[PDB]
RNA sequence: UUGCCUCCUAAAAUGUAACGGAGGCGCCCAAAGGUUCCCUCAACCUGGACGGCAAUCAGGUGUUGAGUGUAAGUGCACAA
RNA sequence: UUUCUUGCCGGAGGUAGAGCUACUGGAUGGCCGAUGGGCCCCACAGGGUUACUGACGUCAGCCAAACUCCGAAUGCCGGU
RNA sequence: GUUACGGCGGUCCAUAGCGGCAGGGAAACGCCCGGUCCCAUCCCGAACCCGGAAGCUAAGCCUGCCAGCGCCGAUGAUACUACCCAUCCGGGUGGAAAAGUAGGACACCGCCGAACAC
């Protein structure tokens, strides 16, 4: 069997760093970096509302069909920093699903 | 032209056996028998050295080399020892002199012990070799009834090549060593 | 239990050196080789 | 071995009950002995 | 009610004299320590306490030789 | 009860009360957890009472882990003193408990119990503390 | 099938030598006005290095091996003399008239000794 | 309590107070100094005689875990 | 101008932080449950229901000024 | 100049280590046979030292492959932080970890001298 890989927004991001991430969250973007067999990670930034729909959703363990600048690349969420207080999703470690490779 | 019984009996006839019984793969993977240290604590040194005076001449007769005096690796109070006091006698012999004093052992003072019903191989300790201790030291025939003092009693450790207890233990079998293998 | 001992070369009986022993390790007299500067050469150096 | 100061080692000659005379090297000054049991006399090692 | 501290040594002013890169004499010292927290290297030698000083001028260079952190005294070419 | 069997040093600074915690903040063992949100010296007086509070809420039944422990003592000069004459000798026993830690953890079947007795555990402790749930 | 459950002989002599060594070398160094003359020996052959820890590039080198030694008879202090007398000519010839003779974490004496007596008297002010 | 040494206070250079938190010191060295050259220590058995948690020198195994004359640190297994 | 500011560069550090299965000290559960207690067969022979101390520890997640596998930011020394 | 080469060295000395699976001794490296000799054991030719090549690549050393243990390890994010704004809350710019993750890694480099080649 098989799970549908959530359909999930996502942005490069124009600017990386703390003051970045920080007016991102605001702004409703969580920060997240894409990487694995990809060798060249990428930064992105999800929405915030949408993504933790997908992950209260599907479990923390869910594939998600990521649009990059509209190009789906499907990823798994392999960490997920949440504040202890906010509980916000505060980052997220994308790891790039091979369609056609295990974890 | 010098060759002792053992040594000779091993080079000949024992190296065969063993190659044969274990298909061992070389011939420097054939065991071979390494030093024999015959090793005493007497124990109640800190009360008398006369004593430890007395296994060392036990020893030097016995074997046939001058003992070491190896004294105490640290001071524990509850034996009434302190560190640097002698408390054992060691002996190391190797090559010809280590194979007669097996051939003496095994051919005159294993037969003369008191009550014997061959050794103990359940304890045969295989890696290292094969200690087992004694009770008592006029049952070495060298020394004499008329020459002894007290009961001594030794630890003959026989240091093999043995790669593990089972090669060990057919090694000290076809030396001779009588053990009580039931 | 250890005092000030003065060391002087035998050979001048000049008190070269000042050390300290204990008097009850080692209650003879201190012989060790040193030399008197106006000797020249190590020469045995015993307590006063 | 350094020198003589361990004890003196020469041939020595044991003759048994069985008379299997073994020819041995010990510090037996005398160098001759007899043993009235022996490996080839004790009942275990002789198959008792 | 009273305290039984109240004790403290003077302190003995250690730690690094000649930061790398600072230009020495032979025979200043470049290092003040108690055991050898830094080894002597080439052209630094250790003094009866633990000092590292320039055995020879030029300029300090904090190494690492054998997992070990090191004093040298690299030499400086006269223009 | 939750008394350190022997402390390296009797005498301690205060312990910071800075930052959020940065470990335990999760619960980790039960169901249900009392998270603080506020810093505190949780002393063994209080965790000993909310955890009696708990035990005797939950009735028969249920386990609660206590992930704090009143580890760092805190000293009180001897009273009517002035200051100075050295340190005061250790009087009671803390747990330096930050904004996001998990104090106490809960595991009952009836949700409605085990609510009810975290809060009496919150009533219990001296700062402001959420039910949490590890249901994320 | 085998299990060498101890460390065997030469792995010990091995490790042995080579911490012997290092404790030398720990004041022993050798540099390209005094380079160091590094002695390895061996129950069949002696082989030295003239070596410069500066740029760790060997100036000289003679060894047992050499059909010269091996023509040499005698026994293996014969040839350790013979060696020694040929990184001596080497040495001079490369520019080098000093050193400072590492033992490789050997014994004085024997075969080394030998080497060093020999290039001594050929003329390394070692 | 007053002098000296070590640590933390002490806010990653140095230094930094309190009747702040801890301890040591008013010595031992003729070897425990110098030097040359060698060696590594803890912890478990194939296994052991009176021998036990612990002796042995049992290395047979095992990777630098003890030991530094003495408080504390900084060091020392390359060894200190 | 050696002063100071700023940029750059070479530095050492062990603070904040964090981690501790990297040490020294305080903590949830299964594992062996080894050393042991009753039951034990009442024999000290032999073995397990072994709710028990259940150790050294094995394996899963948490704290320290006098803890550190680590470790900034500043500050400081020096060069330009 | 080529090697399942031996030594001497370097690395900000584990990306190198430990462990495992397979392989070879040509010169060498080793094990290995002895103690007559230099020399040596707080006893022992075990070690050190001395003579030989009878035997063996089984070990040591070295070759290839294993990512199993250890080792390294980002990028992001976070904690922290210099300065600044801010009437308690916080925030901005610059720096930025530890841990974890992706992963990397079963070493790399220099000198000689060996056997063959030239």
């Given at each position: 069997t098989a799970n549908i890989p959530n359909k999930l927004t996502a942005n490069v991001r124009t600017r990386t760093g703390k003051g970045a991430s920080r007016q991102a969250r605001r702004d409703g973007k969580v920060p997240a970096v894409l990487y694995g067999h990809g060798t060249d990670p990428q930064h992105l930034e999800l929405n915030a509302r949408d993504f933790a729909a997908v992950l209260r959703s599907h479990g923390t363990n869910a594939i998600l069909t990521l649009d990059i600048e509209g190009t789906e690349q499907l990823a798994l969420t392999k960490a997920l920093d949440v504040?202890?207080?906010?509980?916000?999703?505060?980052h997220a470690d994308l790891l790039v699903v091979q369609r056609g490779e295990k974890v | 032209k010098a060759l002792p019984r053992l040594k000779q009996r091993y080079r000949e006839e024992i190296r065969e056996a063993l190659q044969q019984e274990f298909n061992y793969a070389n011939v420097m993977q054939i065991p071979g028998v390494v030093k024999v240290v015959v090793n005493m604590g007497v124990g109640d040194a800190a009360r008398d050295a006369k004593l430890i005076n007395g296994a060392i001449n036990d020893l030097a007769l016995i074997t046939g080399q001058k003992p070491e005096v190896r004294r105490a690796r640290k001071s524990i109070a509850q034996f009434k020892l302190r560190e640097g006091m002698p408390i054992g006698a060691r002996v190391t012999l190797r090559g010809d002199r280590m194979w007669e004093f097996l051939d003496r052992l095994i051919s005159i003072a294993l037969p003369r012990?008191?009550?014997?019903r061959g050794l103990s191989?359940?304890?045969?300790?295989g890696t290292g070799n094969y200690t087992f201790g004694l009770?008592?030291?006029?049952?070495?025939?060298?020394?004499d009834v008329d020459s002894i003092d007290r009961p001594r009693g030794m630890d003959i450790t026989v240091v093999?090549?043995?790669?593990?207890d089972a090669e060990g233990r057919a090694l000290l079998r076809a030396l001779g060593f009588p053990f009580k293998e039931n | 239990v250890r005092p000030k001992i003065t060391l002087a070369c035998?050979?001048?009986?000049?008190?070269?050196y000042i050390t300290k022993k204990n008097r009850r390790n080692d209650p003879d007299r201190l012989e060790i080789k040193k030399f008197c500067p106006n000797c020249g050469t190590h020469q045995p150096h015993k307590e006063s | 071995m350094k020198t003589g100061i361990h004890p003196e080692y020469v041939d020595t000659t044991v003759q048994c009950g069985c008379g299997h005379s073994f020819t041995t090297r010990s510090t037996?000054?005398?160098?001759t002995i007899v043993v009235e049991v022996c490996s080839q006399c004790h009942p275990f090692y002789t198959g008792k | 009610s009273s305290s039984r501290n109240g004790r403290d040594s003077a302190?003995?002013?250690?730690?690094?004299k000649r930061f790398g890169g600072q230009v020495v004499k032979?025979?200043?010292?470049?290092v003040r320590q108690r055991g050898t927290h830094f080894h002597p290297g080439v052209n630094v030698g250790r003094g009866g306490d633990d000092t590292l000083f320039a055995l020879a001028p030029g300029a300090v260079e904090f190494g690492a030789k054998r997992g070990r952190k090191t004093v040298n005294i690299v030499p400086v070419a006269r223009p | 009860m939750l008394i350190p069997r022997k402390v390296k040093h009797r005498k301690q600074h205060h312990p910071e009360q800075r930052?959020?915690?940065?470990?335990?903040?999760?619960?980790?063992?039960?169901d249900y957890g009392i998270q603080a949100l506020e810093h505190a010296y949780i002393t063994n007086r209080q965790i000993e009472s909310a955890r009696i509070a708990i035990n005797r809420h939950i009735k028969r039944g249920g386990k609660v882990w206590?992930?704090?422990?009143?580890?760092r003592p805190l000293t009180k000069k001897p009273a009517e003193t002035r200051m100075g004459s050295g340190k005061g000798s250790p009087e009671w026993w803390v747990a330096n408990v930050k904004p996001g830690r998990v104090l106490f953890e809960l595991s009952y079947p009836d949700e409605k119990t085990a609510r009810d007795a975290l809060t009496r555990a919150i009533h219990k402790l001296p700062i402001k503390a959420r039910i949490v749930t590890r249901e994320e | 099938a085998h299990k060498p459950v101890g460390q065997n002989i030469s792995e010990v002599r091995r490790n042995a030598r080579l911490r012997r060594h290092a404790r030398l070398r720990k004041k022993v160094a050798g540099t390209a006005e005094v380079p160091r003359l590094v002695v390895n020996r061996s129950a069949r052959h002696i082989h030295v290095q003239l070596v410069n820890?500066?740029?760790?590039?060997?100036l000289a080198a003679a060894s047992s091996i050499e059909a010269d030694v091996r023509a040499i008879d005698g026994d293996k202090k014969a040839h350790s003399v013979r060696v020694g007398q040929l990184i001596a000519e080497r040495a001079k010839a490369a520019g080098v008239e000093t050193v400072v003779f590492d033992r490789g974490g050997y014994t004085y004496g024997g075969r080394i000794a030998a080497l060093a007596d020999a290039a001594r008297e050929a003329g390394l002010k070692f």
């Open positions: 504040h202890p207080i906010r509980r916000n999703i505060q | 012990i008191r009550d014997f191989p359940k304890q045969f300790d009770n008592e030291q006029s049952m070495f025939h060298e020394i093999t090549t043995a790669t593990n | 035998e050979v001048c009986k000049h008190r070269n | 037996k000054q005398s160098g | 302190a003995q002013r250690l730690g690094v032979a025979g200043e010292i470049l | 930052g959020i915690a940065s470990g335990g903040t999760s619960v980790s063992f039960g206590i992930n704090i422990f009143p580890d | 820890d500066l740029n760790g590039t060997t």
